[PDB]
Amino acid sequence: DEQQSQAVAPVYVGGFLARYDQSPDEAELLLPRDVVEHWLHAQSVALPLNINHDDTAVVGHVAAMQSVRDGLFCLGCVTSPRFLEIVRRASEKSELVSRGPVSPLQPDKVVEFLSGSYAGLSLSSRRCDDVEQTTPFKHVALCSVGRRRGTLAVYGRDPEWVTQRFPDLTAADRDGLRAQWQASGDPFRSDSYGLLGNSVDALYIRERLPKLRYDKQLVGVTERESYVKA
Amino acid sequence: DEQQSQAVAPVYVGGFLARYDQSPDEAELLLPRDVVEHWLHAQLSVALPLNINHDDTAVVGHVAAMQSVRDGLFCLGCVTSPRFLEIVRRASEKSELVSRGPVSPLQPDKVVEFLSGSYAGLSLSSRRCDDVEQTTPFKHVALCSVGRRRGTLAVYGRDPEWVTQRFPDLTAADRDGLRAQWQSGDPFRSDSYGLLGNSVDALYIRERLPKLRYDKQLVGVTERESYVKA
Numbered sequence: 206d207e208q209q210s211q212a213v214a215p216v217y218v219g220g221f222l223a224r225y226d227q228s229p230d231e232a233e234l235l236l237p238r239d240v241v242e243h244w245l246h247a248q249s250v251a252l253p254l255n256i257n258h259d260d261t262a263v264v265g266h267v268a269a270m271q272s273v274r275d276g277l278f279c280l281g282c283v284t285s286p287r288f289l290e291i292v293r294r295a296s297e298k299s300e301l302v303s304r305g306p307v308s309p310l311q312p313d314k315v316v317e318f319l320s321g322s323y324a325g326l327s328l329s330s331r332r333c334d335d336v337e338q339t340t341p342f343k344h345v346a347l348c349s350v351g352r353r354r355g356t357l358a359v360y361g362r363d364p365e366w367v368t369q370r371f372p373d374l375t376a377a378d379r380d381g382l383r384a385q386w387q388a389s390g391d392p393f394r395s396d397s398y399g400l401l402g403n404s405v406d407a408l409y410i411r412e413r414l415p416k417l418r419y420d421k422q423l424v425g426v427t428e429r430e431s432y433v434k435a
Numbered sequence: 436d437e438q439q440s441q442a443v444a445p446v447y448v449g450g451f452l453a454r455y456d457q458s459p460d461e462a463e464l465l466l467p468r469d470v471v472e473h474w475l476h477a478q479l480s481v482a483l484p485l486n487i488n489h490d491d492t493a494v495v496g497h498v499a500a501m502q503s504v505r506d507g508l509f510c511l512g513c514v515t516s517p518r519f520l521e522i523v524r525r526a527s528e529k530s531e532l533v534s535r536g537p538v539s540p541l542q543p544d545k546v547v548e549f550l551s552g553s554y555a556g557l558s559l560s561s562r563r564c565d566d567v568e569q570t571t572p573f574k575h576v577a578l579c580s581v582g583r584r585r586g587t588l589a590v591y592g593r594d595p596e597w598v599t600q601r602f603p604d605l606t607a608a609d610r611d612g613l614r615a616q617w618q619s620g621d622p623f624r625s626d627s628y629g630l631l632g633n634s635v636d637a638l639y640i641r642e643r644l645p646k647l648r649y650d651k652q653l654v655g656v657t658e659r660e661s662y663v664k665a
């Protein structure tokens with residue numbers, strides 16, 4: 206009963222929403238540093254964090270967005286108790302979760318589950334297309350894999366520890382983030398049936414795993430140890 | 436609420452549990468025709484149960500017929516659990532893949548389409564062969580994201596004949612031997628959280644999609660039209 210309270214405690218997520226050094230496979234995915242930094246400075250209210258862009262599946266909020274040297278990095282927090290309770294339960298029934306985490310990390314079913322199902326981040330921003338460079342950043346979505354390479358999502362119970370998984374990040378970067386991450390109920394208006402529904406869609410994404418490994422390698426989270434399952 | 440009764444009606448599943456013309460990647464998967472036909476004749480008294488990814492608490496129906504044809508062992512089963520179907524009914528409403536609907540002239544069928552996407556394969560549960568003292572060798576059949584034996588693609592439909600009709604290899608004499616065979620409570624002791632749990636595991640099977648397409652091509656279901664999503 207206490208173990209179940211530790212499992213449903215807030216969980217943090219971090220990762221790049223876009224890698225400046227990565228030319229997208231599609232023109233509409235182009236999101237350059239000049240634009241990002243402008244948009245950041247442009248738009249207060251936190252961007253909501255949801256599951257695969259579903260407005261009824263908001264599970265938390267983005268706590269910090271920072272533009273670093275290699276891209277736009279963000280740090281958010283899964284806070285919805287309904288989503289976490291669901292995850293808590295689904296995790297108990299995952300052969301993958303049961304096999305546990307790597308080398309010296311302690312098992313963490315909830316975190317491990319999110320680490321497996323939503324290994325990527327996917328931004329929701331206004332169409333760039335190079336014109337009239339309002340709130341451009343709509344929200345951030347946890348997903349099976351992102352359209353932009355390098356968007357691998359890293360989950361952990363501590364924000365510092367999450368940011369620490371990324372070698373590219375400097376102290377000044379981890380500092381700009383720490384400054385930021387330091388509503389009115391449960392934002393989650395969905396359920397297990399929905400997540401399950403969304404799971405089959407994930408099964409049909411092309412080259413899902415290969416992309417994730419690529420993302421894992423590009424962001425250097427391969428080196429450090431974490432709950433990533435890709 | 437009549438549409439919801441048509442959606443939760445029994446669903447049939449068919450496909451090969453093993454292709455004799457396919458040498459397994461692992462020795463323990465070897466299941467030759469001589470053995471099969473012997474085992475068949477050996478045991479079909481009590482029906483083999485049909486479950487999700489080999490989970491004893493996830494029995495969703497039973498196998499109605501097992502026949503050894505020229506290219507392999509083919510089976511036809513029926514998903515009958517109302518609990519499993521109600522779960523599927525609901526999850527289907529939340530699948531972008533299901534919403535896109537079926538091919539060319541097939542009518543949309545959320546439940547069938549959902550099962551078609553999540554459990555595209557069949558996986559037998561039999562006694563270790565290993566070539567020795569070759570009683571009930573056939574334990575059960577499991578619906579899964581993809582099978583270990585190639586050609587084990589699963590085809591779902593509301594009509595048994597129509598299901599068997601999806602396989603070109605099958606002859607009339609074959610469809611006849613099957614039709615002869617497929618003529619107290621809800622065996623499902625699991626839930627959405629469990630299926631959801633099992634979904635993350637699926638996400639990490641290697642070459643899942645490529646295998647399915649292979650299976651789809653090997654069994655010639657590529658030619659005919661069906662609810663297959665692979």
Ligand SMILES: *[C@@](O)(C(=O)N[C@H](CC)c1ccccc1)[C@H](C)NC(=O)[C@H](CC(=O)N(C)C)NC(=O)[C@@H](NC(=O)[C@@H](NC(=O)CCCCCN)C(C)(C)C)C(C)(C)C
Nearest residue numbers: 233257258326327328329330331332348350351352353410
């Ligand atoms: C993100 O990684 C993602 O969606 N990944 C998914 C996860 C399953 C995925 C898809 C395929 C293969 C693997 C994974 C990805 C980077 N983000 C988007 O694609 C994102 C989705 C989104 O915001 N929604 C579905 C709402 N799309 C966008 O950010 C786009 N923005 C818009 O469409 C915006 N529209 C406009 O500015 C006006 C033009 C008309 C748009 C359509 N009505 C807006 C405000 C609607 C979001 C793009 C920036 C990519 C154009």
Ligand SMILES: *[C@@](O)(C(=O)N[C@H](CC)c1ccccc1)[C@H](C)NC(=O)[C@H](CC(=O)N(C)C)NC(=O)[C@@H](NC(=O)[C@@H](NC(=O)CCCCCN)C(C)(C)C)C(C)(C)C
Nearest residue numbers: 463489557558559560561562563579580581582583584640
């Ligand atoms: C099936 O396709 C499958 O499991 N697919 C899954 C779906 C995701 C998959 C997993 C990884 C990668 C891709 C797909 C596959 C063909 N079936 C099996 O592997 C099957 C599973 C199973 O039966 N259970 C989980 C219960 N395994 C077998 O059929 C094996 N049989 C046994 O292990 C049997 N054991 C014995 O006969 C005795 C062993 C020694 C006893 C000494 N006293 C039994 C009764 C436990 C089933 C094999 C046929 C492979 C031997």
